[PDB]
Amino acid sequence: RKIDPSRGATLGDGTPNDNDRIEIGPTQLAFSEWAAAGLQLPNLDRMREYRWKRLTQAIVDRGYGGLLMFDPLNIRYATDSTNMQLWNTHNPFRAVLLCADGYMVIWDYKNSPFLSKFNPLVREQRSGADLFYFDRGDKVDVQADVFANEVRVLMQDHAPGHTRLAVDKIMLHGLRALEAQGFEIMEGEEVTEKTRAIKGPDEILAMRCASHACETAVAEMEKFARAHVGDGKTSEDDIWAVLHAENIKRGGEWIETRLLASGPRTNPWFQECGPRITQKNEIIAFDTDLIGSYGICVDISRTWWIGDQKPRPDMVYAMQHAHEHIMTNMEMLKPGVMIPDLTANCHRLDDKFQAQKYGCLMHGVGLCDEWPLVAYPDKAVPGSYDYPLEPGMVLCVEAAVGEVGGDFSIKLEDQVLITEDGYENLTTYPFDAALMGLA
Amino acid sequence: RKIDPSRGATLGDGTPNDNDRIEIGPTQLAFSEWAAAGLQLPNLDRMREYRWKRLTQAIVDRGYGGLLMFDPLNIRYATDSTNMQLWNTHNPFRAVLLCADGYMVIWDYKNSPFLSKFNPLVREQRSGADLFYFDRGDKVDVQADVFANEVRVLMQDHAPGHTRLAVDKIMLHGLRALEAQGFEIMEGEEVTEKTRAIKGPDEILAMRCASHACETAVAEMEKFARAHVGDGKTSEDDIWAVLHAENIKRGGEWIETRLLASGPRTNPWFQECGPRITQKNEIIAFDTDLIGSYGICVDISRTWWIGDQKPRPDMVYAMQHAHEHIMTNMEMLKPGVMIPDLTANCHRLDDKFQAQKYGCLMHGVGLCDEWPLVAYPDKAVPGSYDYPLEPGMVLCVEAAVGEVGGDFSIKLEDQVLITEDGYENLTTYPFDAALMGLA
Ligand SMILES: [Fe+3]
Ligand SMILES: [Fe+3]
Ligand SMILES: [Fe+3]
Ligand SMILES: [Fe+3]
């Protein structure tokens, strides 16, 4: 019956206290750690209502009649319902229509209409939005017309007079079928990215929980790495596997990249975690890029020195330079600052680090990496992100620091909330004391 | 610095014996187990040439000038190059163009041109194919035109006279820009799915290795589950986490679904792995849906009974029925058989299992789930997959067996190669003896 005997009919996040329920979420392990940490749990019903209201408002503000979503991350934002998320990312079997009057319909996997029933804001569970060759072979086009006619009828009933339908991403068969029904297809991502960019109070609570769980998982990985690196057998993959397992054990969902590398494989950055046998007296740098508990992305980066010797002075300087970079850049953060002014006033990396610097100095984060992208001045494009920061935005602040042809790089990154009058760094994970020149 | 001291300049798959190399792949753990199991390793160079030749021929055969791929799994097929695959699945930053003359170009993440340089069949490494709102904000359109003009010039030089460009999936800004350059956009998935459907000799060797690694990882998971289920603490997530870690430790890449469930959460099927505390004397059913070593998908399902008591008779019957289903259907497999004849002649499940049966009785598999999909008679669509099986195809054979309103389901699934004369079941994982009604 109850999954948590110490509680009544509901868990702390308001969901049912029922070991046999369909809905998943954080494990008892995660909840125990969070309670011991004194973290306030999100109320999921209020969270789901917040997102839905805000997304509906976004449609209305643009004078659109609706938004059609095939990206599982947008579907997750709109409904909080998951279904084979990773398979869904490259197999578009799922769709959500949200109309300007708030009416929301999901076309789900035929076999699994029950996966969104926990959210009453999802008014209908249908099927048949899977318009790709694996699922339908030479008969995609017939179903594309069935599906587009369904969307037409829903829009006639729930957004009469509107011809503009925003779509995040759709297969060409789907696009043509919708256009044949008389829709003008608008850019759906411009709707979803800007909506998702402002977190409500429950999303922020959810993120604090996910962040705590992610930092716990990383601490397990550090413990494992410092204990086993340089034993002649332990690989990058061995270390990284710890993060995978500890995330899953806390109700997390997946990891977006393979960004953990050791020794000379840290420079250039973006070499992937693999079989390399790790060594004593070497750098290990990683980036969590992690979809964690409550489906919230925790995106932080740390660089470790592991060995009996001291790190080289150039490693210490680089680490200190990287730290100075993100602390200076996050100090720019407060409501009302224009994104291009972040670009213009950002901390200046030394010349020898300019060539291999990161693809941005900041980016948004929520269910994954999100709008905005804050480019360095030499890559920034005029008229691309002319908007101010607002309370409720969350930005990761980045530093990649390495020389061309060098044998190491530093990667640091913290996750930062915009508050009413400034910012709050959510990330508490320590910086390697030897690399920081403190030890 | 060799990663394998017992070898010369190359590893057994022909790749460099170099601990510090960029290229990732199977771990020393995986290679060690495969050697002990007596498995011949693929030659990756010949594998990569096989795929590239076959895909180029597919373009030529259709009278197209090129194939443009944004799906990371098609990119993986064409180049064997990974780059944040999971991030890529829902962030289309990457693109590969293959022209009718075999000329092949990748547009990669700006910061990482080196990630595909190990494959000399990739002739150029460019950037700027990232046409989505996160990456470019309100200036996607400008870059979409830059990108489309580059594709035009390449097609002019390497497929002159062709206007037909196959595209698997592209953002609408990209579609509009390509059509503005005079391209007729063809269905790219019809090209990629049919090409990937036939595995060459080295791909089959890679799949044998991946299958062995995955089966090893599942055996670790089974050991964990049988030792810890019913301790009042161990969750579905705890058990599943073992598969995650053991896959990563062997050079695997990710898991596509969350299909592991315990007790009453197995019925209906497609309930996701979650926080449920597992119980003694209960069914656990799961589906690996796993992207494993060498990036090969291993897609198998097993159902376990764990407890001091015997399974109920209806459980044993359902298991035997499920096993009979896949063995009977698998027996249909040999070259020349038309896919809808598989549909027409499949084993018939008992009436009480029909309503909740699986979405297909078979589907292709390679780098992930692939064409064809073999539907049950009541879902099959005429003219959707009118094609014969061929040697080198690999099909998973499925069984979901459960009653409406029931408190358990069985899920069984094996991965089967089509041979010159018939079939070869690649899957050797045991079936639960107690559920099979054996002492
Ligand atoms: Fe990151
Ligand atoms: Fe980041
Ligand atoms: Fe499966
Ligand atoms: Fe399958």
Chain A, window 4-23: residues with a beta carbon less than 8 angstroms from a chain B beta carbon: 19-20, 22-23
Answer yes or no: do B207 and B160 share one domain. no
How far is residue B221's CA from residue B118's CA, in Å, rounded to a whole number? 35
CATH of the domain at A339: 3.90.230.10
Distances (CA, A) of B36 to B9, B74, B218, B286, B292: 21, 32, 18, 27, 19
Q: Between chains, do B115 and A270 touch, taking CB under 8 Å as contact?
A: yes
Q: Between chains, do B23 and A274 touch, taking CB under 8 Å as contact?
A: yes
Q: Between chains, do A136 and B384 touch, taking CB under 8 Å as contact?
A: yes
Distances (CA, A) of A302 to A185, A260, A283, B178: 42, 10, 11, 41
Interface-testing mutation among A31, A276, A365, A379, with chain B (most B C-beta atoms within 10 A): A276
Tokens 């055996």 belong to residue = B219
Interface-testing mutation among B32, B69, B81, B89, with chain A (most A C-beta atoms within 10 A): B89
Q: What is the number of other CB atoms lying within 10 angstroms of the CB of residue B185?
A: 17
Q: What is the number of other CB atoms lying within 10 angstroms of the CB of residue B310?
A: 14
How far is residue A174's CA from residue A180's CA, in Å, rounded to a whole number? 10
Q: Is B298 helix (H, G, I), strand (E, B) or coil?
A: strand
How far is residue B87's CA from residue B93's CA, in Å, rounded to a whole number? 9
Interface-testing mutation among B85, B130, B237, B395, with chain A (most A C-beta atoms within 10 A): B237
Q: List phi, psi (to 5°) of B104.
A: -135, 130
Q: Could you tell me which residues are beta bridge partners of residue A410?
A: A401
CATH of the domain at B2: 3.40.350.10
Give the tokens for residue B225.
Answer: 């589950």
Nearest by CB to B27, which of A3, A29, A235?
Answer: A235
Name the DSSP class of A177: H
Give the tokens for residue B151.
Answer: 């594709």
Tokens 């030089």 belong to residue = B157
How far is residue A225's CA from residue A236's CA, in Å, rounded to a whole number? 9
Q: Do A285 and A412 form a contact (C-beta atoms < 8 A)?
A: no
Distances (CA, A) of A236 to A187, B15, B21, B364: 40, 18, 13, 32
Four-residue CA torsion sign, B365, B366, B369, B370: negative
- Of residues A296, A370, A224, A225, the one with CA closest to residue A34: A296
How far is residue A250's CA from residue A34's CA, in Å, rounded to a whole number? 11
Q: Is B192 helix (H, G, I), strand (E, B) or coil?
A: helix
Give the tokens for residue B268.
Answer: 């209906």
Helix (H) or strand (E) holding A167: strand A164-167
Four-residue CA torsion sign, A131, B372, B301, B212: negative
Name the DSSP class of A118: T
- Of residues A137, A297, A188, the one with CA closest to residue B171: A188
Answer yes or no: do A346 and A367 share one domain. yes
Measured torsion, CA atoms of residues A9, A11, A14, A17, in degrees rounded to the nearest 10 = -40
Task: Please give the single-letter amino acid code of residue A243.
Answer: L
Q: Between chains, do B383 and A274 touch, taking CB under 8 Å as contact?
A: no
Answer yes or no: do A69 and A213 share one domain. no
Q: Could you tell me which residues are beta bridge partners of residue B305?
A: B283
Interface-testing mutation among B112, B193, B249, with chain A (most A C-beta atoms within 10 A): B249
Answer yes or no: do A195 and A263 share one domain. no
How far is residue B288's CA from residue B207's CA, in Å, rounded to a whole number? 15
Q: Do A115 and A108 form a contact (C-beta atoms < 8 A)?
A: yes
Answer yes or no: do B186 and B232 share one domain. no
Strand order in the sheet with B297-298: B254-255, B290-291, B297-298
Beta strand A369-374 with A362-365: parallel, antiparallel or unpaired?
antiparallel
Q: Is B148 helix (H, G, I), strand (E, B) or coil?
A: helix
Ligand 4 centroid distance, CA of B398 (Å): 6
How far is residue A324's CA from residue A436's CA, in Å, rounded to a whole number? 11
Task: Please give the single-letter amino acid code of residue A410.
Answer: I
Q: What is the number of other CB atoms lying within 10 angstroms of the CB of residue A153?
A: 11
Give the tokens for residue B128.
Answer: 């700027």
Instruction: Assign residue A287 a region (left: φ > 0; alpha: ψ between -120 and 50; beta: otherwise).
Output: beta
Q: What is the number of other CB atoms lying within 10 angstroms of the CB of residue B344?
A: 11
Closest-CA residue of A relative to B185 is: A172
A220 interfaces chain B, CB cutoff of 8 Å: no
Contacts of A250 in chain B (CB under 8 A): 237
Q: Could you tell me which residues are beta bridge partners of residue B414?
A: B397
Four-residue CA torsion sign, B42, B43, B48, B54: negative
How far is residue B254's CA from residue B264's CA, in Å, rounded to a whole number? 27
Task: Please give the single-letter amino acid code of residue A169.
Answer: K
Interface-testing mutation among B22, B117, B134, B365, with chain A (most A C-beta atoms within 10 A): B134
Q: Is A16 helix (H, G, I), strand (E, B) or coil?
A: strand
Nearest by CB to B111, which of A132, A235, A269?
Answer: A269
Tokens 């601990």 belong to residue = B19
- Calculate how close chain A gets to B394, using CA atoms only, in Å: 14
Instruction: Assign residue B263 a region (left: φ > 0; alpha: ψ between -120 and 50; beta: otherwise).
Output: left
Burial class, B204, CB count within 10 angstroms (exposed 0-12 / middle 13-18 / buried 19+): buried
Beta strand A104-107 with A124-126: parallel, antiparallel or unpaired?
parallel
Q: Could you tell me which residues are beta bridge partners of residue A417?
A: A394, A424
Q: List phi, psi (to 5°) of A184.
A: -95, 115
3-class secondary structure per residue, A212-276: HHHHHHHHHHHHHHHHHCCCCCCEHHHHHHHHHHHHHCCCCCEECCCCEEEHHHHCCCCCCCCCC
How far is residue A209's CA from residue B268's CA, in Å, rounded to a whole number? 31
- Of residues B308, B311, B310, B292, the one with CA closest to residue B300: B292
Nearest by CB to A193, which of B85, B133, B370?
Answer: B133
Task: Please give the single-letter amino acid code of residue B403.
Answer: E
Number of H helices, E strands in chain A: 13, 17
How far is residue A344's CA from residue A351's CA, in Å, rounded to a whole number? 17
B134 interfaces chain A, CB cutoff of 8 Å: yes
Q: Between chains, do B263 and A20 touch, taking CB under 8 Å as contact?
A: yes
Ligand 3 centroid distance, CA of B209 (Å): 18
How far is residue B163's CA from residue B159's CA, in Å, rounded to a whole number? 9
Q: List phi, psi (to 5°) of B322.
A: -65, -40
Answer yes or no: do A278 and A216 share one domain. yes
Q: Is B124 helix (H, G, I), strand (E, B) or coil?
A: strand
How far is residue A403's CA from residue A150's CA, in Å, rounded to a whole number? 56
Give the tokens for residue A94.
Answer: 């799922």
How far is residue A77's CA from residue A66's CA, in Å, rounded to a whole number? 16
Query: At which of B199, B217, B242 does a domain end?
Result: B199
Whether omega for the bond prior to residue A372 falls within 30 degrees of 0, making it cis, is yes
How far is residue B164's CA from residue B154's CA, in Å, rounded to a whole number? 13
Interface-testing mutation among A33, A89, A291, with chain B (most B C-beta atoms within 10 A): A89
Answer yes or no: do B133 and B252 share one domain. no
A388 interfaces chain B, CB cutoff of 8 Å: no
Give the tokens for residue A429.
Answer: 């994970």
Contacts of B72 in chain A (CB under 8 A): 90
Nearest by CB to A111, which of B19, B87, B359?
Answer: B359
Chain B, window 40-99: residues with a beta carbon less than 8 angstroms from a chain A beta carbon: 71-73, 82-87, 89-91
Beta strand B362-365 with B369-374: parallel, antiparallel or unpaired?
antiparallel
How far is residue A395's CA from residue A392's CA, in Å, rounded to a whole number? 10
Four-residue CA torsion sign, A171, A177, A178, A180: positive
Q: Between chains, do A20 and B265 touch, taking CB under 8 Å as contact?
A: yes
Name the DSSP class of B138: G
How far is residue A428's CA from residue B396's CA, in Å, rounded to a whole number? 46
How far is residue B255's CA from residue B234's CA, in Å, rounded to a whole number? 21
How far is residue A286's CA from residue B316's CA, in Å, rounded to a whole number? 48
Answer yes or no: do A177 and A308 share one domain. no
- Of residues A56, A77, A103, A96, the one with CA closest to residue A291: A77
Q: List phi, psi (to 5°) of B80.
A: 60, 20
Query: At which of A169, A199, A229 does a domain end?
Result: A199
Strand order in the sheet with B95-99: B124-126, B104-107, B95-99, B66-69, B164-167, B184-187
- Calculate how close chain B gets to A24, using CA atoms only, in Å: 5
How far is residue B264's CA from residue B409's CA, in Å, rounded to a whole number? 8
- Calculate how close chain B gets to A4, using CA atoms only, in Å: 10
How far is residue B343's CA from residue A226's CA, in Å, rounded to a whole number? 55
Distances (CA, A) of B364 to B62, B134, B359, B379, B398: 22, 34, 13, 17, 11
Q: Is B143 helix (H, G, I), strand (E, B) or coil?
A: helix
- Of residues B138, B155, B147, the one with CA closest to residue B175: B147
Contacts of A355 in chain B (CB under 8 A): none
Chain B, window 313-372: residues with a beta carbon less than 8 angstroms from a chain A beta carbon: 356, 358-359, 363-364, 368-372
Largest interatomic CA distance in chain B: 72
For helices A201-228 and A28-36, what crossing angle results, to 10°? 100
How far is residue B238's CA from residue B275's CA, in Å, rounded to a whole number? 8
Q: Is A97 helix (H, G, I), strand (E, B) or coil?
A: strand
Number of H helices, E strands in chain B: 13, 17
Alpha helices in B65-185 (DSSP H): 72-79, 85-90, 133-136, 140-158, 172-180
Q: How many CB pairs under 8 A join A and B?
A: 271
Beta strand A254-255 with A184-187: parallel, antiparallel or unpaired?
unpaired
Answer yes or no: do A311 and A342 share one domain. yes
Answer yes or no: do B228 and B146 share one domain. no
> Number of structural domains, chain A?
2
A1 interfaces chain B, CB cutoff of 8 Å: no
Q: Do A104 and A82 form a contact (C-beta atoms < 8 A)?
A: no
Q: Between chains, do A241 and B237 touch, taking CB under 8 Å as contact?
A: no
3-class secondary structure per residue, B253-296: CEECCCCEEEHHHHCCCCCCCCCCECCCCEEEEEECCEECHHHC
Alpha helices in A374-436 (DSSP H): none
How far is residue B329's CA from residue B325's CA, in Å, rounded to a whole number? 6
Q: Do A178 and A167 form a contact (C-beta atoms < 8 A)?
A: yes
Q: Do B106 and B68 form a contact (C-beta atoms < 8 A)?
A: no
Give the tokens for residue B9.
Answer: 């300049």
- Calculate how close chain A gets to B91, using CA atoms only, in Å: 9
Ligand 2 centroid distance, CA of A285 (Å): 14
Closest-CA residue of A relative to B26 is: A275
Give CA B158 to chain center in angstroms: 31
Q: Between chains, do B112 and A268 touch, taking CB under 8 Å as contact?
A: yes
Contacts of B358 in chain A (CB under 8 A): 111
Closest-CA residue of A relative to B110 is: A359
- Of residues A341, A133, A318, A82, the one with CA closest to residue B273: A82
Query: Who contacts A164 (Cβ-Cβ below 8 Å, separation ≥6)?
Result: A62, A63, A64, A65, A183, A184, A186
Helix (H) or strand (E) holding B187: strand B184-187
Chain A, window 258-277: residues with a beta carbon less than 8 angstroms from a chain B beta carbon: 258-259, 263-265, 268-277
Q: Do A76 and A295 form a contact (C-beta atoms < 8 A)?
A: yes
Query: Who contacts A412 (Cβ-Cβ below 8 Å, separation ≥6)?
Result: A301, A302, A303, A319, A322, A323, A325, A326, A398, A399, A401, A431
Q: Could you tell me which residues are beta bridge partners of residue A338?
A: A388
- Calculate how close chain B gets to A199, using CA atoms only, in Å: 17
The beta-carbon contacts of A221-229 under 8 Å, at least 24 apart in sequence, are A221/A246, A222/A304, A225/A278, A225/A284, A225/A304, A225/A306, A226/A304, A226/A306, A229/A262, A229/A278, A229/A279, A229/A280, A229/A282, A229/A284, A229/A306
Query: At which of B151, B175, B199 does a domain end?
Result: B199
- Of residues A41, A388, A395, the one with CA closest to residue A209: A41
How far is residue B378's CA from residue B354's CA, in Å, rounded to a whole number? 10
Q: Between chains, do B275 and A27 touch, taking CB under 8 Å as contact?
A: yes
Residue B165 domain boundaries: 1-199
- Of residues B345, B321, B303, B246, the one with CA closest to residue B434: B303
How far is residue A318's CA from residue A197's CA, in Å, rounded to a whole number? 32
Give the length of chain A. Answer: 439
Beta strand B410-418 with A301-306: parallel, antiparallel or unpaired?
unpaired
Answer yes or no: do A107 and A117 share one domain. yes
Q: Do B266 and B302 form a contact (C-beta atoms < 8 A)?
A: no
Nearest ligand, measured from the Cα of B301: 3
Answer yes or no: do B215 and B184 share one domain. no
The string of DSSP letters for B329-382 reads HHTT--TT-BHHHHHHHPPPPPHHHHTT--S-SEEEESSSEEEEEE--TTT--T
How far is residue B28's CA from residue A234's CA, in Å, rounded to a whole number? 10
Helix (H) or strand (E) holding A147: helix A140-158
How far is residue B330's CA from residue B424's CA, in Å, rounded to a whole number? 9
Tokens 């289309």 belong to residue = B92
A376 interfaces chain B, CB cutoff of 8 Å: no
Helix (H) or strand (E) holding B208: helix B201-228
How far is residue A423's CA from residue A425's CA, in Å, rounded to a whole number? 7
Helix (H) or strand (E) holding A52: helix A44-61
Contacts of B363 in chain A (CB under 8 A): 134
How far is residue A95's CA from residue A84's CA, in Å, rounded to a whole number? 13
Beta strand A184-187 with A164-167: parallel, antiparallel or unpaired?
parallel
